[PDB]
Amino acid sequence: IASRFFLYTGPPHVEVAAEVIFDGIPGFPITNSFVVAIIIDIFVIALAVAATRNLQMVPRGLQNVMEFILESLYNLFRNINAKYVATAFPLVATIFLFVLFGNWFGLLPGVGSIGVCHPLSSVAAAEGEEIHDTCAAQGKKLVPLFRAPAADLNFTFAIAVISFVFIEYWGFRALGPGYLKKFFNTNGIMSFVGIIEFISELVKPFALAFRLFGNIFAGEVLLVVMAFLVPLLLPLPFYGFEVFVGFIQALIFALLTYAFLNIAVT
Amino acid sequence: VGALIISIASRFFLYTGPPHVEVAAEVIFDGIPGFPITNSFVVAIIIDIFVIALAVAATRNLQMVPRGLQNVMEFILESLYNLFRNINAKYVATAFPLVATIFLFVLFGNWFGLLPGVGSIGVCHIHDTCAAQGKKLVPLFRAPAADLNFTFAIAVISFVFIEYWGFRALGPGYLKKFFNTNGIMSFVGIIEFISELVKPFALAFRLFGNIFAGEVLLVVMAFLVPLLLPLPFYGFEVFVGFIQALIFALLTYAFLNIAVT
Amino acid sequence: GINPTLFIAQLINFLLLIFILRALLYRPVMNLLNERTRRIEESVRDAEKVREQLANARRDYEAEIARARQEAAKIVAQAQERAKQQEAEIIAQARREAERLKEEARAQAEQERIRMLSEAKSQIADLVTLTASRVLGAELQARGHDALIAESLAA
Amino acid sequence: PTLFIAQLINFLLLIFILRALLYRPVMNLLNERTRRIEESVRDAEKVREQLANARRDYEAEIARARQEAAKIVAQAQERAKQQEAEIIAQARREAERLKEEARAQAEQERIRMLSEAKSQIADLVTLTASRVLGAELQARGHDALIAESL
Amino acid sequence: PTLFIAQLINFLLLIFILRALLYRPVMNLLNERTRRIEESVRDAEKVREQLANARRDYEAEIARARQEAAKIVAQAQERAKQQEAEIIAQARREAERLKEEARAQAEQERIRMLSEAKSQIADLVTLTASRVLGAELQARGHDALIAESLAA
Amino acid sequence: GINPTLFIAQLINFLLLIFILRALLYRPVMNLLNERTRRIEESVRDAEKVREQLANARRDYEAEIARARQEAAKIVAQAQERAKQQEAEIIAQARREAERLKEEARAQAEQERIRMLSEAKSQIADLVTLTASRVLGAELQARGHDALIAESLA
Amino acid sequence: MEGLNLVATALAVGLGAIGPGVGIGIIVSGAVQAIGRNPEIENRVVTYMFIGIAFTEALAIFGLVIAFLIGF
Amino acid sequence: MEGLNLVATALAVGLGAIGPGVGIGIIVSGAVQAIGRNPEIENRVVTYMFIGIAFTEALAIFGLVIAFLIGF
Amino acid sequence: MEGLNLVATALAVGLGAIGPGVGIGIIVSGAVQAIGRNPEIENRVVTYMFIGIAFTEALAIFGLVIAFLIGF
Amino acid sequence: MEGLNLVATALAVGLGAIGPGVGIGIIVSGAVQAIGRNPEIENRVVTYMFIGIAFTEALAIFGLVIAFLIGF
Amino acid sequence: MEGLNLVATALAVGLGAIGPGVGIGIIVSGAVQAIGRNPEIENRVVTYMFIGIAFTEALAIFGLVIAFLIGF
Amino acid sequence: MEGLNLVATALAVGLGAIGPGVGIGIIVSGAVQAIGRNPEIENRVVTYMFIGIAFTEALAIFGLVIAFLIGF
Amino acid sequence: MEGLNLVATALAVGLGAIGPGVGIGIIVSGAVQAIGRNPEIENRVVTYMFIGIAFTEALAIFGLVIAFLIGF
Amino acid sequence: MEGLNLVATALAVGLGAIGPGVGIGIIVSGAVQAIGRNPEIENRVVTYMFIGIAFTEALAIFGLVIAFLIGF
Amino acid sequence: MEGLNLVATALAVGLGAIGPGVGIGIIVSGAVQAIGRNPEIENRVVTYMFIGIAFTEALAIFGLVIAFLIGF
Amino acid sequence: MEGLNLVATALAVGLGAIGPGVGIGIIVSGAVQAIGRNPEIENRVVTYMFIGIAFTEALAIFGLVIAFLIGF
């Protein structure tokens, strides 16, 4: 069972960085995150149109799976607030469906392996291999073409700020001028808690963005460094944990935006 | 007595200088070419004389209905029997002399440390008495519980007692415990083994540290102000000495009880 | 990395995504609402159709009891009509026939009795026999004559 | 690069493990859900059509009940006719017995009539003989017979 | 040293506090305990004395029972002898009465049978008188007696 | 310090303490203690013993009284309950004696049967005087053949 | 010596993690126990629950902000 | 050194986060459990809960002030 | 350099927030739970709750004045 | 000194693990007790426990991401 | 490096204000719970509560009785 | 000055064991306490317990990752 | 470092008053709650409680002793 | 620096004792409370508790491993 | 680096007071709570409490042992 | 610079006593509560308690031996 942990074929080191700009020879250069965002857009649109193209009673196959996921998410949101479950559903649904596939893309062979570049070779008596990467030529860093979209602080900040503006739009939609009444109302001790609530309301999008970005970053980097430790037979349970945590985090992000909507509107 | 105590500033008039008591070792009282008689051994002999005299006074008549000092002597013995009978069923007659001896001896050793002159009376080999002369001062009547040579002896005799009465109770099976389980008690057995090794050290060190802390606390609170501040600490230490004696006795007997079963 | 241009690009990409998926999530909402309305209204109309089927059964028993009652009424009506008819028959023919039989019978009685009103049928032979012989005598002896005896015999 | 093979084999192993650990429960739950919706559409639809044609089955049952009325009318009619025949038959045979009894009584009173006739002619004989002797006892009466050899 | 005064004053005031606070409860506990022991031994001694007195009472009671049994047996024997003698005397009296009454009845019966013998002799006298009167009344006497009855 | 000399000295002192206190403070006073406990147990047993003995005393009093009653019931026989048989025998003897006297009284018929012997002076006289004063007009005209052929039924 | 800014950043984010982590844990445990005890008030509970988190997590975010003021 | 002020700000913010964080957590957990036990007293305790928060968070605020002084 | 004064005042304020923060948290949680259990007693225990705070924040205030003698 | 960056990464990761570890522990224990008392309320208890778990674990994530920024 | 003494003052009041502090909260919490369950014993409990505080604050006073000796 | 790497590895491992250790202890204590009061829910609830462990262990593994990373 | 003795005093006073403070808090809270139910046992539950205090206070005094052996 | 390697072993082992020790105490206390409440589930309970011990002891073992590695 | 020995002794006694102090607090609180729930079992359970009372002090006084080995 | 071995021994023992002390406090408080709830199962409970406690101080024992390996 534990007889074939051969580390002789493995990565030389670990490459850890923030989002990396793709080559992008023409103007407006895309990133490594803004090619996988496009590929996940295409994938989710293909799945939606495959479920859409044949709609009928007693669903079976992928259409049944999509309907089950949608109704499960509907029931999850209806528990929090049944008034807006049919109204704000598209945003939370696409947040969940997008971050789900963004996190599940990170496990794919090639994420951190393919590069655009804008045994004997391994070090002995060491647990980590030292086989140089392909583009060791010209001293290039082997820029990872595929990097998980949610592991970037730009797309994540984007969805966080759209969540912020959605919560504020649809809390201001039907509350009158009650937001100014909710914060610093100068009513006994409630002014202090209103000020702190305003600060918390300001820091919700930053908290969400940092949380999800760091979660995917930590997952992918853990995968990288523990493949660097032992290339095989070590990271199966941790790969399972990382795919599970990516899925559940994609869920919790949508639930957090919906719960913030509920607490803002009530 | 009023709370408006003026004598709180008695350190200006009565200053005891630095807390000259830090000795974590044994200081010889009498120069003997053979085995030296330390400060703790002379008090071990003194407390042995006191215990023997108390026993003689209590059991010279053995009159039926206990009154006076006979009642006081018999009360603590009855209480100790009740406690050990609660702990264990039938080994009380086998172990009671040992546990009662440790309780009485270290209780009287602990309660000796309050008698004045423990840190003041001493022999020449703010500036005490011997420091006026060239000879250094070593205190007399150090509490025996402070001496490790005493607490370690109590620890080893308790360890020998528990091992003897575990071996005799459980046959050769207690010698190797149940190491052959290999499913549950294989990595556990060595843990219990090292636990049995450490427990006598802990038993001796508990008395050691508690009594040492008692005397040094008394000395340093005298150093701060030697009036009315160290009174709660004196009461606390006279309580903790009896408590230490009792908890030592109950733990050696409870260790025997957990060893036989 | 911190860059506003890429952030704005991601914002625009997600706006396109939310619009496309707004269409593709607007489709299943009244897919499922249509399914649920179909189910609930179908259960309601199934209970309704059960009730109307029971209404047919209720009208069935109503027609059954009504038809049984008019059948019973018409059979007893015919029974008593023909009953009265045959009582009229039995008493009428009984009385008239009996009266006719007794009147012809007494007429025959008078016809049998008229024939004895003649001299030889008036039993004169036994009269003269008992007068002559059964008087302990031979003939018209002792208290016996001929003329007045025959006159009284004629009576 | 050298990490590609490790990533590929790790994905293949994790996919195999996820399959062998979770594939049966997920299609089990999916199949349970689609069978729930499947029964709730198909049984509903078949009951819906078998109750939508029940509006015509109602008139069919009405016609069946009319045919029930038909043969109960027939059986009640036949019951009435044969009961009527029975009562009229017993009435007629009772009438026949009554006229026969009338004829029997006529014969009986004919017997009584003759009987009275012979009794009447008999005591007419007696009276005639009495007057016969009492009119002409004077011939040879009150002599040779008063004694009569006592 | 100067620590001497501090140590004695602290120990003295501590002992004063203990004797002003803890001395009463321990004294009360010791008094209660010795009272319990004294009452227990007194109860045991009283029970032992009760058992000794009870054994003595049992022996005295069985002695009284044997004495009463002897008295009852003696009384029964005396009474039985008494009624035996009395019933024998009664039987003797009944025998004397029976024999005297029977002897008197026998004497009266001898007198009545003498009277019966006299009556038998009288009846015999009538019988032989009729028998002799039969004689000598067949040769004569039939006449003049019927005539006497006719005379009346 | 960890000097083995003081270690051994304190161990020896404590062993002597144990083996001396178990001759003067553990054995004697605790023998007294469990002796007192045994005395209490004896007392609580003896209370039940007292109750049982009192019940035994009452039972034995009743049993001895019952034995006295049985003895008296046998004593009424006295070996002379046959005294009633003596009464019956005395009655029978008196009846037999009475029968003997009655037989002697019936023996008076022995000289009753010699009473007809006076017929020579009594029967003849009254016989002749009866006919001399009855039927025959009180006259002895008929001789009457004197005594009958059977005489006085002789 | 080296730069103390790195140690400062690390200490700030770390302690901001140790405090509000236990705070949010206790808040959510109490809220879910109250939900299990009585679901009828459930909606009201989550309202207050989130307010508590909106305070407690905020403190942690403050620490993180300090990190991004020191590391940057 | 030069980063000692940064270490001071970091330590102040961190520890003022770990105290009031757990304090607010315990306050809200207890309050929500009380709400679940009985909703009638709810409002009458909710202000009290906020009053409690208004103390503990104040301590954190103190720490924040100590940060913003040291850095300024 | 003598920048240890900043670290000193930072530590003092941070620890004064560390202890009393959790103290007030436990105090208010217990007071609110007991108030919800029995409402009519509430006023008495409210004082007691404040009494507890009146001691516990004192400790924090104590640390704060040390900062005022260090941070100056 | 020289290798203070290693100490910084260690401190950040370690304290991030310190806090949310107890946070998730308490959250899961409370949710498990709640589901044990009332299995019918699971369908929202589990979701609430998961969102609380994310809220707590986000702080350990912040600590670790700061540590990786410092080390890298 | 004399300013290190101030740092000592920082811990002396500081650490000693965070041990008893939290403990005091528990005391008061427990006390208030006793008022909830049974008010008739209340008064006795109150004294005992103060007795408990009379230890913890004593420790806190110790934590300060050295601090003023360290930093006057 | 030069032995800081070993100290950093020690701190990372130690605190990453400090947090999740208490986390798993509390998790499994709560799980088994719910098991005792309701046996038939076990095959459900235990899974969630493991899920919770799968997070807390992660944090510990988190620290273990850094220890190896800074160790190598 | 000649100023380390004062830091040693501060650590001995403060770090030694961490465990005993919470010990008094938990002990007095438990004793008060145990007095609330069945107050007739209130005397007996005193004894062990004070016994418990007389242990932890010792620990506190323990550390205090070391302080008076360092600053003196 | 001549030291800073033995200090690594000390810190690692001590913290790996801090965490898992509390974990083991909590888990077995909860297990034994479940045993007292529910006897006949015991065996299953026991197994689960044992599992938790292992899933905690590993972290302690990890600390020991660091001692084995650093101490060599 | 003079004065390091004093810092070591202070640390040893401080942590030895840290652990077993809260230990005894929990021990005595649990024992008196069980006594209040049921008094008659006290005579059997109090002894066991003292076993725990003597199992934490051992580690604590162990520190003093070590403390003395740097204290002298 | 030279007393780092003393600091290592002190940290090893104190950090090994921080955790197991409160761990065994928990273990015996829980065992005592379970004993009070159900004395009949006591013996099993008692055995398991000891098994549990036998693990916990073992960690401290490891820490102890580490200090000896540094003390020797």
From TrEMBL, chain B:
Subunit structure: F-type ATPases have 2 components, CF(1) - the catalytic core - and CF(0) - the membrane proton channel. CF(1) has five subunits: alpha(3), beta(3), gamma(1), delta(1), epsilon(1). CF(0) has three main subunits: a(1), b(2) and c(9-12). The alpha and beta chains form an alternating ring which encloses part of the gamma chain. CF(1) is attached to CF(0) by a central stalk formed by the gamma and epsilon chains, while a peripheral stalk is formed by the delta and b chains.
Pfam families hit by this protein: ATP-synt_A
Protein family: Belongs to the ATPase A chain family.
MF terms (GO), sorted A to Z: proton-transporting ATP synthase activity, rotational mechanism
Cystines in this chain: 124-130
Highest taxon in the source lineage: Bacteria
Described purpose of this protein according to its UniProt entry: Key component of the proton channel; it plays a direct role in the translocation of protons across the membrane.
Major subcellular site: membrane
Transmembrane regions listed in the UniProt entry: 1-15, 35-57, 91-112, 148-166, 207-229, 236-256
Keyword Transmembrane helix: yes
Cross-referenced CDD domains: ATP-synt_Fo_a_6 (cd00310)
Gene3D superfamilies according to UniProt: ATP synthase, F0 complex, subunit A (1.20.120.220)
Organism expressing this protein natively: Chloroflexus aurantiacus (strain ATCC 29366 / DSM 635 / J-10-fl)
HAMAP family: ATP_synth_a_bact
Name listed for the protein in its UniProt record: ATP synthase subunit a
Keywords: ATP synthesis, Cell membrane, CF(0), Hydrogen ion transport, Ion transport, Membrane, Transmembrane, Transmembrane helix, Transport
Any one GO BP annotation for this protein: proton motive force-driven plasma membrane ATP synthesis
Gene name as annotated: atpB
Bilayer topology: Multi-pass membrane protein
InterPro entries (UniProt xref): ATP_syn_F0_a_bact/chloroplast, ATP_synth_F0_asu, ATP_synth_F0_asu_AS, F0_ATP_A_sf
GO cellular component: plasma membrane; proton-transporting ATP synthase complex
Organism ancestry: Bacteria, Bacillati, Chloroflexota, Chloroflexia, Chloroflexales
Subcellular location: Cell membrane; Membrane
